Design an enzyme around this catalytic site. Structure first.
Site, PDB file in Angstrom:
ATOM      1  N   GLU A  36       0.673  -1.143  -0.058  1.00 17.53           N
ATOM      2  CA  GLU A  36       0.002  -0.135   0.175  1.00 17.53           C
ATOM      3  C   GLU A  36       0.881   1.134   0.042  1.00 17.53           C
ATOM      4  O   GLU A  36       1.868   1.443   0.329  1.00 17.53           O
ATOM      5  CB  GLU A  36      -1.003  -0.090   1.094  1.00 17.53           C
ATOM      6  CG  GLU A  36      -0.527  -0.270   2.607  1.00 17.53           C
ATOM      7  CD  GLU A  36       0.240   0.702   3.261  1.00 17.53           C
ATOM      8  OE1 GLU A  36       1.259   0.552   3.855  1.00 17.53           O
ATOM      9  OE2 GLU A  36      -0.181   2.126   3.116  1.00 17.53           O
TER      10      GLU A  36
ATOM     11  N   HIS B 178      -9.929   4.285   3.725  1.00 14.16           N
ATOM     12  CA  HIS B 178      -8.982   3.437   4.646  1.00 14.16           C
ATOM     13  C   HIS B 178      -9.315   1.904   4.401  1.00 14.16           C
ATOM     14  O   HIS B 178      -9.657   1.337   5.496  1.00 14.16           O
ATOM     15  CB  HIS B 178      -9.114   3.945   6.056  1.00 14.16           C
ATOM     16  CG  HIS B 178      -7.722   3.597   6.723  1.00 14.16           C
ATOM     17  ND1 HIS B 178      -7.647   2.767   7.922  1.00 14.16           N
ATOM     18  CD2 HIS B 178      -6.307   3.977   6.574  1.00 14.16           C
ATOM     19  CE1 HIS B 178      -6.622   2.629   8.151  1.00 14.16           C
ATOM     20  NE2 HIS B 178      -5.812   3.128   7.672  1.00 14.16           N
TER      21      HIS B 178
HETATM   22  N1  LIG Z   1      -8.033  -3.557   6.837  1.00 12.91           N
HETATM   23  C1  LIG Z   1      -6.674  -4.002   6.754  1.00 12.91           C
HETATM   24  N2  LIG Z   1      -5.619  -3.101   7.073  1.00 12.91           N
HETATM   25  C2  LIG Z   1      -4.313  -3.413   7.016  1.00 12.91           C
HETATM   26  C3  LIG Z   1      -4.214  -4.913   6.504  1.00 12.91           C
HETATM   27  N3  LIG Z   1      -2.743  -5.352   6.299  1.00 12.91           N
HETATM   28  C4  LIG Z   1      -2.240  -3.975   6.709  1.00 12.91           C
HETATM   29  N4  LIG Z   1      -3.070  -3.247   7.118  1.00 12.91           N
HETATM   30  C5  LIG Z   1      -2.752  -1.772   7.321  1.00 12.91           C
HETATM   31  O1  LIG Z   1      -2.249  -1.221   5.853  1.00 12.91           O
HETATM   32  C6  LIG Z   1      -0.949  -0.615   6.869  1.00 12.91           C
HETATM   33  C7  LIG Z   1       0.381  -0.924   6.351  1.00 12.91           C
HETATM   34  O2  LIG Z   1       0.943  -2.193   6.796  1.00 12.91           O
HETATM   35  C8  LIG Z   1      -1.866  -0.461   7.787  1.00 12.91           C
HETATM   36  O3  LIG Z   1      -2.558   0.952   7.686  1.00 12.91           O
HETATM   37  P1  LIG Z   1      -2.257   2.530   7.445  1.00 12.91           P
HETATM   38  O4  LIG Z   1      -2.114   2.470   6.182  1.00 12.91           O
HETATM   39  O5  LIG Z   1      -3.245   3.103   8.179  1.00 12.91           O
HETATM   40  O6  LIG Z   1      -0.985   2.903   8.124  1.00 12.91           O
HETATM   41  C9  LIG Z   1      -2.353  -1.161   8.353  1.00 12.91           C
HETATM   42  O7  LIG Z   1      -3.400  -1.184   9.290  1.00 12.91           O
HETATM   43  C10 LIG Z   1      -5.438  -5.743   6.312  1.00 12.91           C
HETATM   44  O8  LIG Z   1      -5.310  -7.051   6.134  1.00 12.91           O
HETATM   45  N5  LIG Z   1      -6.530  -5.157   6.396  1.00 12.91           N
END
Ligand SMILES: Nc1nc2c(ncn2[C@@H]2O[C@H](CO)[C@@H](OP(=O)(O)O)[C@H]2O)c(=O)[nH]1
EC number: 3.1.27.-
Length: 108
Positions: free
Chosen positions: A71, A100
């Site tokens: 991401e 988000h």
């Molecule tokens: N909802 C969700 N968030 C995720 C998952 N894996 C990683 N994240 C998130 O994406 C990020 C990077 O590891 C984190 O958020 P952020 O973009 O708010 O920092 C984090 O919470 C997932 O499987 N589901």
């Protein structure tokens, strides 16, 4: 810089990495960024967070043996991080989310 949905998406397709203005969470943390402080722009001027693993725990994106996701923050400038993210796969599928990871739209 290159920080829009289309700008980053096209750079990813073209170079297979994020543009020079992105830094992972551990890079940001090493520079002085603290989650909740909203200080990213002061410790790392002109930088955005991106490149870290997206797990897809909720299964909202298509899964495939060997496919992983990463991401990147979109439209960040300064202050508290927003809710805009590009999520991109090892096979170069690219989805955007403006809430988000609640909902996604495919764009590549
Ligand atoms: N909802 C969700 N968030 C995720 C998952 N894996 C990683 N994240 C998130 O994406 C990020 C990077 O590891 C984190 O958020 P952020 O973009 O708010 O920092 C984090 O919470 C997932 O499987 N589901």
């Amino acid at each position: 810089v290159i920080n829009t949905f289309d700008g980053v998406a096209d750079y990813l397709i073209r170079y297979k990495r994020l543009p020079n203005d992105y830094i992972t969470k551990s890079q940001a943390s090493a520079l002085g960024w603290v989650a909740s402080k909203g200080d990213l722009a002061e410790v790392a001027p002109g930088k955005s967070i991106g490149g870290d693993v997206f797990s897809n725990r909720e299964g909202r994106l298509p899964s495939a043996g060997s496919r992983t996701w990463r991401e990147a923050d979109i439209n960040y400038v300064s202050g508290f991080r927003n809710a805009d993210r590009l999520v991109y796969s090892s096979d170069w599928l690219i989805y955007k989310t403006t809430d988000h990871y609640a909902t996604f739209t495919r764009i590549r």
